[PDB]
């Protein structure tokens, strides 16, 4: 009669590493690193993303003619750009504090695109709806959808006087621009005076703008420039616009609703009807493992990123058949 | 001491082997395997809980004249990634070393338990097996694993047999 004691041996060839030994063979192992992903832009907690596609934040917020379809969107979980998102400011110029606007928009869960000033009866003494060839639509000149270009009427340009009182229960993102013609001829032809000013004032905002006339290199075919500005009205606040000229007046603004867990990502993946908890530019992640080596960028409860190629851990005996 | 593992055993991590006049085969030890499984599961829970979730780490844009801030943000991102990559790899090495030592300790503890039970009624051999000086049937074998090996019920009769050596 004989009895003996030993341990399990297996015909599986997992290998692991320790402090003193490398490539140690173990009967069982568990991988702590995820490297597989869905490969598609999925839905996050039941809400589809804002797939900007052709255009980017600047074009989406100014409403340039190439992505007019986005104007019906009201709620989202994350904003998705694409590598070929080139359509932004169709008219050349500097979008001032652009990266601050992107950071502010990175926390919005929805908004209401409403009409601050009505084009029909808010500017009765000025010509409304100028057009440019830099923002062509269907081969015909057009302009931004959320901004209104104002111009003289009957050979005169009276002083602007309009103001808006925020009776909405939320912050209103107001957008406008100041035009900087290329030469004095364009300034006279459009506004009828060489020296003009634009003053925008609120309970916590106060700034004055003046045109600058110079010859500039042609960008997108125009020697002029429009500098785009923005501010956030606090609930109950009032904003006043005064201008002797050179005003690309606001037309539509956004009553913003804040949120958590949003962000802006650049992705090439396609859309699908699946749901997910974690999303990366590469695709969704469907595992609860502690680590990840797919992409540093994350939206939602994603596993932590590490540069490792393998993080197996030993959960079994040593294999010595 | 033990000359490798067993490929014949299917159930359990640590097990016994026996052959006598009425059978042969293997049998696992449930008490030891379950405790080991609890230990490993505890480690798995510890590693998952002590590591936080990357709730949201989207990128950031900087202006032409803000390259100092861009490099500072890049430095922060790279520095945290390097620290967490180092922590993850070192943690894996530490848990692997502890787990493998844990398995070795468990086998040795059971080996000592068998020794204490038999108490020199069998001739211990280097390969780790115990060869008895007495007859030990299935009831005797089962008692060894169950922890109810009655010493005098097998010791006295083996005195002459051992002395004959």
């Amino acid at each position: 009669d004989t009895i003996c004691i030993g341990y399990h041996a297996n015909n599986s060839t997992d290998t692991v590493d320790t402090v003193l030994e490398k490539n140690v063979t173990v009967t069982h192992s568990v991988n702590l690193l995820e490297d597989s992903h869905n490969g598609k832009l999925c839905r996050l907690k039941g809400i589809a993303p804002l797939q900007l596609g052709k255009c980017n934040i600047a074009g989406w917020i100014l409403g340039n003619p190439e992505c007019e379809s986005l104007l019906s969107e009201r709620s989202w979980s994350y904003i998705v750009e694409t590598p070929n998102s080139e359509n932004g400011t169709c008219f050349p110029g500097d979008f001032i504090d652009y990266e601050e606007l992107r950071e502010q928009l990175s926390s919005v869960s929805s908004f209401e695109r409403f009409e601050i000033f009505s084009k029909e009866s808010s500017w009765p003494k000025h010509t409304t709806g100028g057009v440019t060839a830099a923002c062509s639509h269907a081969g015909k000149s057009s302009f931004y959808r959320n901004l209104l270009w104002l111009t003289e009427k009957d050979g005169s340009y009276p002083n602007l006087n309009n103001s808006y009182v925020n009776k909405k229960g939320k912050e209103v993102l107001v957008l406008w621009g100041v035009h900087h013609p290329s030469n004095i001829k364009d300034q006279q032809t459009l506004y009828q005076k060489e020296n003009a000013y634009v003053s925008v004032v609120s309970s916590n905002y106060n700034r004055r703008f003046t045109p600058e006339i110079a010859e500039r290199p042609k960008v997108r075919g125009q020697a002029g420039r429009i500098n785009y500005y923005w501010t956030l009205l606090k609930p109950g606040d009032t904003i006043m616009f005064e201008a002797n000229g050179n005003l690309i007046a606001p037309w539509y603004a956004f009553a913003l609703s804040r949120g958590f867990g949003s962000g802006i990502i650049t992705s090439n993946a396609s859309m699908h009807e699946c749901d997910t908890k974690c999303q990366t530019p590469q695709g969704a992640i469907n595992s609860s493992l502690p680590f990840q080596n797919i992409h540093p960028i994350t939206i939602g409860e994603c596993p932590k990123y590490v540069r490792s190629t393998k993080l197996r851990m030993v959960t079994g005996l040593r294999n010595i058949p | 001491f033990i000359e490798g593992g067993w490929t014949g055993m299917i159930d359990g991590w640590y097990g016994y082997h026996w052959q006598n006049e009425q059978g042969s085969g293997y049998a696992a030890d449930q008490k030891s395997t379950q405790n080991a499984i609890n230990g490993i599961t505890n480690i798995v829970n510890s590693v998952i809980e002590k590591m936080n979730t990357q709730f949201t780490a989207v990128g950031k844009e900087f202006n032409n004249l803000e390259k100092r801030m861009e490099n500072l943000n890049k430095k922060v991102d790279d520095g945290f990634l390097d620290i967490w990559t180092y922590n993850a790899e070192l943690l894996v090495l530490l848990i692997n070393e502890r787990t493998l030592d844990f398995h070795d300790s468990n086998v040795k503890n059971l080996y000592e338990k068998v020794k204490n039970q038999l108490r020199n009624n069998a001739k211990e051999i280097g390969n780790g097996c115990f060869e008895f000086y007495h007859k030990c049937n299935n009831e005797c074998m089962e008692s060894v694993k169950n922890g109810t090996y009655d010493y005098p019920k097998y010791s006295e009769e083996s005195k002459l047999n051992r002395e004959k050596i």
Partner: nanobody
Amino acid sequence: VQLVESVQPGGSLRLSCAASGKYVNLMSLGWFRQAGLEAVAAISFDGKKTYYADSVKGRFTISRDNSKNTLYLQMVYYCAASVVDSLGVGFYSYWGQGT
């Protein structure tokens, strides 16, 4: 760590088990029955592999899928999870309420 789960002279009856407790998704699951306690079937994580008892004879395809981290068994019974990808009775530590 927990699991929740939920006969005639003919046909087969389907039953399902759902993961419960902290991140059970990372653990393998198996099914057991008692008249003694014995294993029936197990499935590894991500459905890599399946094991069955002698009585199965390869029938009763098990699967697990998205909805509530459930697994189904079809052509008292309890389910348990283990961290080891084996059907061994010894590797199961967390058990359901039985049905």
